[PDB]
Amino acid sequence: MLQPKRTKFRKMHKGRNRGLAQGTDVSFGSFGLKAVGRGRLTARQIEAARRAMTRAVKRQGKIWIRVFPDKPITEKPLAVRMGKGKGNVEYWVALIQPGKVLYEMDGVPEELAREAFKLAAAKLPIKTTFVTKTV
Amino acid sequence: ALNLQDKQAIVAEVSEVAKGALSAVVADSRGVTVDKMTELRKAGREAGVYMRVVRNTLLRRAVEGTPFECLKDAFVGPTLIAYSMEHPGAAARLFKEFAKANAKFEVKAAAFEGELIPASQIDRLATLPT
Amino acid sequence: MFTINAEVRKEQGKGASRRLRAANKFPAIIYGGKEAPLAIELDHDKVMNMQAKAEFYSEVLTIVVDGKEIKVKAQDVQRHPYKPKLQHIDFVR
Amino acid sequence: QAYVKLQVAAGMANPSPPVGPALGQQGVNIMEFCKAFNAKTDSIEKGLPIPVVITVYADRSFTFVTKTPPAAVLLKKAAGIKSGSGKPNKDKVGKISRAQLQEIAQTKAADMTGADIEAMTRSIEGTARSMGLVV
Amino acid sequence: MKVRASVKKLCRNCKIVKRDGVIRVICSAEPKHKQRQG
RNA sequence: AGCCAGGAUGUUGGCUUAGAAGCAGCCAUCAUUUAAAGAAAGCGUAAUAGCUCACUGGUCGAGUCGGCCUGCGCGGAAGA
Ligand SMILES: [Mg+2]
Ligand SMILES: [Mg+2]
Ligand SMILES: [Mg+2]
Ligand SMILES: [Mg+2]
Ligand SMILES: [Mg+2]
Ligand SMILES: [Zn+2]
Fold this sequence. Notes:
Chain A is an alpha+beta fold.
């Protein structure tokens, strides 16, 4: 889906997720989807929200995906004891802080942007709000 | 429903009460598009563009399209009274064309309120050169 | 050409700034030129309604502070991280 | 009273499959319809649906409305086409002019509810651009 | 009556009203539209 | 918000089934003839008829409408 095609190291630490975000301003497009909650998006959820909003605006006007999954989250299997190494790497997540703008859009009306980002925000685990550009 | 359009229609109505000595009571209650269609088809057929079936029939926009003249024609404002003006002749038979428009199968609510054209009696005056 | 009423803020830090943002008055600074910077604090209602319309980030502003008018220009604004709120405004004379 | 605005092509009379009982479903049969239909089809030039509009009273005698054929089909005979083009902005079939439309719509003074010549002109050009003949 | 857990107007004739502490959508025309937040 | 109201020609848009009329949708997509006028916005329509409504006037006489930041609540909420 959305994974880095090459990495230095296979399995990464868990790490905490504290502090406020960076990409708060809507840089590229005109209408952005700002995550007000705090959690981890995944490659599945990012591809699901992107194809939902592409169906929503009917492929007119540019989409921007801003956060990209590059932190692998591993899962030990079932019927496996707790020892014996860190488990195999299954899927990739992208850490989100409060304030991260996830998707941007231009070449669409404002109201169609509202409907599209509602339709794609209902497939993401973190609570998100709408935002527009400013100068 | 919009301020500057209301003011410019007031300006058009005072310019056209300057223009036409035939200001006429058209008093529809159930105003038919096909009576509008004959009233506009004959307007384009024997006029230019100046003639309409104009409804600016507001209770206090008639009273401020008034104050050019006919300053006792404010009580002809309310109670469903409409106004149509047209230039050539001293109350030409297009008055009776609009009257036949308000009388063709209609609900009998025309009543010719008067518009104070000759400063005469309230009745129907069809005294014309013809 | 807007006229914003300011007030000279006494003490500055993390604490007094967070107390002002609790009491609905975000702080701001005015630098520029050879004169000293000045520590102003503003209401949040008026300046959010002003920065809605985009002439606020465009034209010459005017600050009524201590009675004396100051012509100034909006330079650099820190917004809230995840809200429609303002944190701080850099003003250049 | 007791009318319709619908007719199939006036090259055929007594048209019992296409319209038929749309004119004579009621007690009035189709014999005066076909007789006077041919008698009015002889006036306007052929190759056109020349429509009849029925009235009636309680005496089974009347005088119908003999109206001019549609400018759709006047443009059809003007361009030589009957089935013009499906999906009218994909394939190219032709382009028409205001003078020819004046020559077509000069005689519609007793059928058109329009006292503007250029209104009829650009309206029938819009009819052509919905037909397939993009002007 | 579809007993949804998120009632939502689906036309213009639908009216959201509050009986007994629950929310309901009552429609004048289509009885499929009638809902209740339960 | 009620309330008495009214509400297209080009045209019944080319099609293509079968009749294309608002309904069968694609592609068009405006000039009014302009109180206001929808190549009608929906419905089930054998197309056949319409109901409304979009808007405008009457009546009536003090506020009304929809978004954001919110405090406290509501539903979501089923186990021996
Ligand atoms: Mg750490
Ligand atoms: Mg961090
Ligand atoms: Mg502290
Ligand atoms: Mg009960
Ligand atoms: Mg339930
Ligand atoms: Zn409903």
